[PDB]
Amino acid sequence: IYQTSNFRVQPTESIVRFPSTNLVKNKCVNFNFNGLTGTGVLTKSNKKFLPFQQFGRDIVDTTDAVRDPQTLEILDITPCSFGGVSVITPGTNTSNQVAVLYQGVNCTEVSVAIHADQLTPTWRVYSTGSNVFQTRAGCLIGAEYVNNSYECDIPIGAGICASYQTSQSIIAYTMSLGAENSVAY
Amino acid sequence: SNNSIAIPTNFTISVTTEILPVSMTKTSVDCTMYICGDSTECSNLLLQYGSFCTQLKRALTGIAVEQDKNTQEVFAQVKQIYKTPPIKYFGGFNFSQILPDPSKPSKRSPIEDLLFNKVTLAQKFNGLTVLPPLLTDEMIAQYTSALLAGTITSGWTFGAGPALQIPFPMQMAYRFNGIGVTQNVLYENQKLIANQFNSAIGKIQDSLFSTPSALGKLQDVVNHNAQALNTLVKQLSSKFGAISSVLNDILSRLDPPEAEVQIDRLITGRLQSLQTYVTQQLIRAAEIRASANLAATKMSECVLGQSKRVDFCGKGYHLMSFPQSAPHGVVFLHVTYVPAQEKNFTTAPAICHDGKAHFPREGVFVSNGTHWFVTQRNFYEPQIITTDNTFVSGNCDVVIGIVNNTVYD
Amino acid sequence: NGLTVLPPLLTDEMIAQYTSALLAGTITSGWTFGAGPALQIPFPMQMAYRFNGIGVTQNVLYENQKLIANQFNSAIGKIQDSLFSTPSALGKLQDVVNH
Amino acid sequence: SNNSIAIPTNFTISVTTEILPVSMTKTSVDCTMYICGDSTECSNLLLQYGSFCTQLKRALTGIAVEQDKNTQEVFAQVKQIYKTPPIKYFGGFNFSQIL
Amino acid sequence: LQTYVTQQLIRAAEIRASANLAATKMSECVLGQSKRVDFCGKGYHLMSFP
Ligand SMILES: *[C@@H]1O[C@H](CO)[C@@H](O[C@@H]2O[C@H](CO)[C@@H](O)[C@H](O)[C@H]2NC(C)=O)[C@H](O)[C@H]1NC(C)=O
Ligand SMILES: *[C@@H]1O[C@H](CO)[C@@H](O[C@@H]2O[C@H](CO)[C@@H](O)[C@H](O)[C@H]2NC(C)=O)[C@H](O)[C@H]1NC(C)=O
Ligand SMILES: *[C@@H]1O[C@H](CO)[C@@H](O[C@@H]2O[C@H](CO)[C@@H](O)[C@H](O)[C@H]2NC(C)=O)[C@H](O)[C@H]1NC(C)=O
Ligand SMILES: *[C@@H]1O[C@H](CO)[C@@H](O[C@@H]2O[C@H](CO)[C@@H](O)[C@H](O)[C@H]2NC(C)=O)[C@H](O)[C@H]1NC(C)=O
Ligand SMILES: *[C@@H]1O[C@H](CO)[C@@H](O)[C@H](O)[C@H]1NC(C)=O
Ligand SMILES: *[C@@H]1O[C@H](CO)[C@@H](O)[C@H](O)[C@H]1NC(C)=O
Ligand SMILES: *[C@@H]1O[C@H](CO)[C@@H](O)[C@H](O)[C@H]1NC(C)=O
Ligand SMILES: *[C@@H]1O[C@H](CO)[C@@H](O)[C@H](O)[C@H]1NC(C)=O
Ligand SMILES: *[C@@H]1O[C@H](CO)[C@@H](O)[C@H](O)[C@H]1NC(C)=O
Ligand SMILES: *[C@@H]1O[C@H](CO)[C@@H](O)[C@H](O)[C@H]1NC(C)=O
Ligand SMILES: *[C@@H]1O[C@H](CO)[C@@H](O)[C@H](O)[C@H]1NC(C)=O
Numbered sequence: 096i097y098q099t100s101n102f103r104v105q106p107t108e109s110i111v112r113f114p115s116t117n118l119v120k121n122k123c124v125n126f127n128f129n130g131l132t133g134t135g136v137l138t139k140s141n142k143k144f145l146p147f148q149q150f151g152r153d154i155v156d157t158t159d160a161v162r163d164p165q166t167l168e169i170l171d172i173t174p175c176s177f178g179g180v181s182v183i184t185p186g187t188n189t190s191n192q193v194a195v196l197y198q199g200v201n202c203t204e205v206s207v208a209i210h211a212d213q214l215t216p217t218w219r220v221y222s223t224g225s226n227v228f229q230t231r232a233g234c235l236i237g238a239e240y241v242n243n244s245y246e247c248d249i250p251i252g253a254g255i256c257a258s259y260q261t262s263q264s265i266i267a268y269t270m271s272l273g274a275e276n277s278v279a280y
Numbered sequence: 281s282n283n284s285i286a287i288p289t290n291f292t293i294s295v296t297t298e299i300l301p302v303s304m305t306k307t308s309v310d311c312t313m314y315i316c317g318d319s320t321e322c323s324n325l326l327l328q329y330g331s332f333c334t335q336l337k338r339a340l341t342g343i344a345v346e347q348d349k350n351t352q353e354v355f356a357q358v359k360q361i362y363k364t365p366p367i368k369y370f371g372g373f374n375f376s377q378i379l380p381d382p383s384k385p386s387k388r389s390p391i392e393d394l395l396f397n398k399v400t401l402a403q404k405f406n407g408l409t410v411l412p413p414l415l416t417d418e419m420i421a422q423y424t425s426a427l428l429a430g431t432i433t434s435g436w437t438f439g440a441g442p443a444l445q446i447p448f449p450m451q452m453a454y455r456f457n458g459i460g461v462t463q464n465v466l467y468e469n470q471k472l473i474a475n476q477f478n479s480a481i482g483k484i485q486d487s488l489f490s491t492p493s494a495l496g497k498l499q500d501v502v503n504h505n506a507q508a509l510n511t512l513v514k515q516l517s518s519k520f521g522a523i524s525s526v527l528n529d530i531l532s533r534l535d536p537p538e539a540e541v542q543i544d545r546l547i548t549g550r551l552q553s554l555q556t557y558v559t560q561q562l563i564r565a566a567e568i569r570a571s572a573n574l575a576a577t578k579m580s581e582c583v584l585g586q587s588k589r590v591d592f593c594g595k596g597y598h599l600m601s602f603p604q605s606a607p608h609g610v611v612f613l614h615v616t617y618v619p620a621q622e623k624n625f626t627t628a629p630a631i632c633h634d635g636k637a638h639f640p641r642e643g644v645f646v647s648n649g650t651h652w653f654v655t656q657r658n659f660y661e662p663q664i665i666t667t668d669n670t671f672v673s674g675n676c677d678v679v680i681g682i683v684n685n686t687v688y689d
Numbered sequence: 690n691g692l693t694v695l696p697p698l699l700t701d702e703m704i705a706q707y708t709s710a711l712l713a714g715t716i717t718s719g720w721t722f723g724a725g726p727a728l729q730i731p732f733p734m735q736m737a738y739r740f741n742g743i744g745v746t747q748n749v750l751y752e753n754q755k756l757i758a759n760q761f762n763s764a765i766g767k768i769q770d771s772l773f774s775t776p777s778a779l780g781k782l783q784d785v786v787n788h
Numbered sequence: 789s790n791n792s793i794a795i796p797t798n799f800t801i802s803v804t805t806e807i808l809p810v811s812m813t814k815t816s817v818d819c820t821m822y823i824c825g826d827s828t829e830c831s832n833l834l835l836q837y838g839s840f841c842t843q844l845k846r847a848l849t850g851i852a853v854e855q856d857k858n859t860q861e862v863f864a865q866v867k868q869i870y871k872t873p874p875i876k877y878f879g880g881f882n883f884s885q886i887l
Numbered sequence: 888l889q890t891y892v893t894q895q896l897i898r899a900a901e902i903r904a905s906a907n908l909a910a911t912k913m914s915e916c917v918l919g920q921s922k923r924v925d926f927c928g929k930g931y932h933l934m935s936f937p
Contacts, residue, residue: 098341155510198409232411254419272361277363280445281729283731285731288726288728553838589915619726673746678751680754697856698856698859699860707864708937712883713870714868743933754880758879764802765803782809801933810905811906815895823888848892854903861910865918
């Protein structure tokens with residue numbers, strides 16, 4: 096397994112809310128709240144702001160909340176998804192088909208970015224195929240999840256391995272610790 | 281004194297603990313996202329430094345691989361996944377606090393639950409990610425349970441080949457035979473000893489959660505990793521001698537030829553920060569690897585067999601050990617043997633009989649004031665002197681300190 | 690220029706006291722003071738036990754006690770010379786002071 | 789040969805020495821004095837370089853703390869300060885050079 | 888300053904390894920009799936003094 100590059104989810108449009116378009120939620124979108132620049136996902140929050148406070152601040156230095164200039168609303172700010180990209184492959188002496196693992200993302204967001212907007216992922220022509228399985232380590236594309244147990248061949252994530260089955264294909268499963276046994280005390 | 285000796289008349293069973301870190305957090309860094317972000321000019325300027333980042337990526341990848349290798353080496357010692365019989369009777373020994381609990385979905389022993397609920401903790405930065413470990417918590421708990429089941433129902437036989445069954449009291453007698461105490465001591469004190477053992481185990485619980493500084497070693501790793509990550513994140517808001525800490529203001533506040541130097545200063549500062557972080561991580565990884573090697577050795581020697589090294593598997597004469605899983609580490613429960621209730625005695629090196637010196641086979645000559653007896657070293661149990669338990673091998677006019685008495689044939 | 694040296698927590702006399710305690714314990718008790726309470730035993734008897742621990746019977750010591758001790762004494766004397774004559778023996782501790 | 793053996797008929801007592809480093813020097817450094825000295829302009833320029841010096845001080849303090857733990861682990865092996873008897877007769881053995 | 892600190896850290900790690908070895912030797916060769924070959928001297932071990 097090798098790590099090659101990184102992927103980013105591009106913004107769709109821009110939002111201006113001077114107290115001048117509408118506002119969009121649950122989308123990686125640019126925004127500008129009276130000089131407050133930056134882009135990200137805006138979702139409603141439950142942080143009871145002070146009557147004279149409008150900004151937000153995380154533990155160290157980054158904004159994580161903002162108040163709507165028009166109506167009294169509290170909503171969060173989240174950076175758009177990013178992460179590394181890994182390629183799973185056997186030797187070229189064996190086959191030429193591969194598998195891709197998007198690290199630390201939910202499969203639904205990747206699927207929407209790929210097959211709905213067709214322009215958000217950084218590597219578009221690079222991105223092909225449709226076989227989706229979701230793991231705790233990220234979204235795995237190009238491998239069929241069997242429900243058997245084998246000795247680990249190519250480690251992937253939290254107890255998930257992959258191998259070249261046998262027609263010939265690439266499978267993903269849960270590794271087997273060992274043979275079951277019980278001595279009769 | 282040079283004709284006096286002390287011999288214990290009672291013993292004690294004591295249980296201690298030991299905590300060792302095993303692994304640490306795995307992280308990966310993206311240079312362009314961290315240093316530049318979404319600026320083309322910054323990337324073009326950074327391209328002039330060559331290959332300062334492939335080295336960092338390789339070092340971080342090596343650390344990440346070594347972290348998984350450490351846990352694989354420490355815990356994956358056996359291949360068969362042994363199981364314990366449904367009927368939990370072992371001649372009075374109660375293993376409830378260490379065997380897995382069926383009721384809990386986590387399938388963990390109560391002590392493991394205490395450790396997990398005690399340690400606790402301390403997501404997306406600017407180009408900084410954390411990778412999950414290869415082995416989950418349930419798999420580690422399964423390995424620990426398999427080791428416990430192997431060491432309860434088989435003794436040390438499963439560490440050198442096929443597992444061979446044996447009743448538990450006979451295994452304990454074998455283990456007493458390994459420290460210089462005869463078998464009959466256990467069989468005549470089987471009911472008492474077990475009780476002592478049970479009591480010790482209970483105290484262990486009250487000695488873990490009540491004291492807050494017991495599990496400090498495992499908390500230090502998490503605290504240090506979080507501190508390093510927070511420092512690296514917070515370093516991004518420093519001017520480093522330039523006019524601003526934001527690339528956008530520098531770009532859209534001055535002509536490009538002047539902005540080149542301002543961007544270059546920030547590039548140099550952030551490169552220095554990354555290098556410092558990577559070097560510190562490398563040193564800490566080396567230390568953690570040394571600790572993991574020590575933990576693996578202790579697992580191999582104290583758990584899979586009986587050790588004769590002094591103070592290696594606990595204070596006192598070693599008997600056995602039990603492993604428990606902890607976040608980023610392991611915990612050992614050493615069971616030892618301690619003498620008590622000594623007593624004055626008078627001893628002689630040899631016994632003269634018909635002009636012949638007599639030496640004991642396995643024991644020490646001891647006198648209570650009137651009669652002479654031969655007894656084993658580590659437990660007071662006098663015996664009548666006989667030619668069965670002595671060898672002559674000498675004469676009466678050589679040894680210094682000989683005492684002449686009678687030896688019935 | 691702001692570069693200070695801190696003193697160690699334990700002075701040399703305390704370390705000497707620890708060493709003296711260890712020596713007294715290993716002379717007057719043997720290995721019994723490291724696993725519990727200390728128990729008395731005459732020195733020739735524990736020497737016989739230590740010979741028995743390497744596959745040699747007891748009577749070898751008791752019939753050579755005068756000779757063996759002599760040898761031991763002589764060896765100790767030579768320790769006073771080899772360290773004193775050769776000055777490169779303590780090169781391990783000097784480097785720490787030097788570097 | 790397949791029917792020949794050799795067995796010693798006498799022995800020898802030998803004493804060797806071994807030297808091991810344990811600890812080293814504990815130091816501490818002040819950034820402002822070393823880098824700048826007593827000029828306010830240099831300090832005002834230095835405070836723009838982030839928190840390098842906090843990390844340096846923390847590392848030095850960690851080393852200094854570890855240096856004492858090394859000695860405590862090595863030497864504090866016992867709980868009682870055992871004392872040797874006034875009369876030093878141990879069957880002919882002479883410990884005057886080490887007591 | 889950074890170079891000095893890094894070199895000091897490396898030397899501290901080496902000294903810690905040496906101290907651990909010394910502690911093990913104190914535990915095994917002084918408080919008991921060892922059977923490990925060539926660990927507490929060349930020959931069959933009898934005793935040691937610090
Ligand atoms: C060795 O020590 C044990 C532990 O104290 C002694 O066992 C106790 O004996 C008394 C006397 O009958 C009982 O009242 C206690 O209940 C016992 N303790 C336990 C935990 O059961 C034992 O008697 C001692 N051995 C000798 C020979 O005195
Ligand atoms: C073994 O120890 C367990 C405790 O871990 C005993 O189970 C009972 O546990 C409850 C609460 O956990 C206590 O209030 C009881 O006092 C425990 N019972 C006894 C007899 O002490 C269990 O009974 C013990 N014995 C066996 C054979 O499992
Ligand atoms: C075993 O070796 C010892 C050491 O050499 C022998 O003792 C020496 O014997 C010679 C010859 O009689 C004397 O000149 C020396 O003075 C002795 N040395 C000491 C320290 O007393 C001993 O004789 C040897 N054993 C046998 C059986 O020959
Ligand atoms: C133990 O060894 C020491 C060291 O040799 C002996 O002290 C010597 O004794 C002789 C005779 O009295 C003197 O001539 C030396 O000057 C002493 N040496 C030193 C360094 O003081 C000591 O006598 C020996 N113990 C016994 C009991 O004989
Ligand atoms: C992905 O998003 C869906 C949306 O409902 C959610 O149900 C699912 O739990 C998410 N997966 C992860 C791993 O968070
Ligand atoms: C695999 O696991 C069991 C096997 O019988 C089955 O219940 C489950 O639905 C299977 N999952 C698949 C085929 O995706
Ligand atoms: C040891 O034995 C000798 C015999 O020569 C005697 O003088 C001495 O008092 C004894 N030791 C003690 C402590 O009594
Ligand atoms: C053994 O003898 C010593 C010497 O007087 C004495 O102090 C000690 O109390 C005695 N031990 C017992 C158990 O009486
Ligand atoms: C000493 O042992 C003898 C064994 O024959 C016994 O008769 C005697 O009573 C014992 N002495 C004491 C004080 O118990
Ligand atoms: C037996 O021991 C006594 C006391 O030491 C001694 O007087 C006697 O001579 C010894 N017996 C023989 C035959 O030497
Ligand atoms: C082994 O023994 C045989 C006869 O017992 C003898 O001929 C042969 O030489 C011996 N081997 C060696 C290597 O001496």
